Design a protein around this ligand. Structure first.
Ligand SMILES: *[C@@H]1O[C@H](CO)[C@@H](O[C@@H]2O[C@H](CO)[C@@H](O)[C@H](O)[C@H]2NC(C)=O)[C@H](O)[C@H]1NC(C)=O
Ligand SMILES: *[C@@H]1O[C@H](CO)[C@@H](O)[C@H](O)[C@H]1NC(C)=O
Lengths: 104, 104
């Protein structure tokens, strides 16, 4: 139940890109989920702010929430698509895949 | 209800660090709160992944969650403190003050 990367597959049909695209038909976009709480490492899975916010939340849970599980590393995906002039284009889409999660 | 920066003043005395922390006696540590949903405001600086995730969540709310409202721009603060051996240390702690929030 800790802050971690979960598997998620996105087909290009879900984006309505299916008719445009040749390869791939989808990709593993993945997602960050989990409770953000101690232990926390400021050189691994948390920021200094996230450590301080966890402390404030423990003292006053009413008004300040816990930090949240978000990406630390994102990868690009390369897509091969057709255009109207029947050109074959290779486009790199940055910040598209989740590699590692952390508390922010 | 939308993702934004909320003001929060962190005083070291309520944290219980007043003895060993010389300067400052507190600081404006702010926090991120709110829903990451469409419309995604340009200030959010949402990644391509966050956009896809808010879209995937809208189709299957059951399994895939909304992306995180987290800090996009942090500031460092200098802390003057007493070491465990009574030495006076002047450390710059990075990622300490939230300047701006966003979705990822
Ligand atoms: C942040 O990273 C640390 C270690 O780098 C993770 O530490 C583990 O915490 C879990 C939960 O208590 C335990 O199973 C292990 O005993 C811990 N290892 C160490 C070396 O302390 C920690 O879970 C991570 N935090 C989050 C929110 O993901
Ligand atoms: C800035 O704003 C938009 C829309 O929310 C986003 O898609 C883009 O990636 C952001 N740019 C940077 C440089 O963070």
């Amino acid at each position: 139940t800790a802050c971690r990367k979960h598997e998620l597959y996105v087909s290009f049909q879900d984006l309505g890109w299916q008719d445009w695209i040749i390869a791939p038909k989808g990709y593993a976009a993945n997602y960050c989920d989990g409770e953000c709480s101690f232990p926390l490492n400021a050189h691994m899975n948390a920021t200094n702010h996230a450590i301080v916010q966890t402390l404030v939340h423990l003292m006053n849970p009413e008004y300040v929430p816990k930090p949240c599980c978000a990406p630390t590393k994102l990868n690009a995906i390369s897509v091969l698509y057709f255009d109207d002039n029947s050109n074959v284009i290779l486009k790199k889409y940055r910040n598209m895949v989740v590699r590692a999660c952390g508390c922010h």
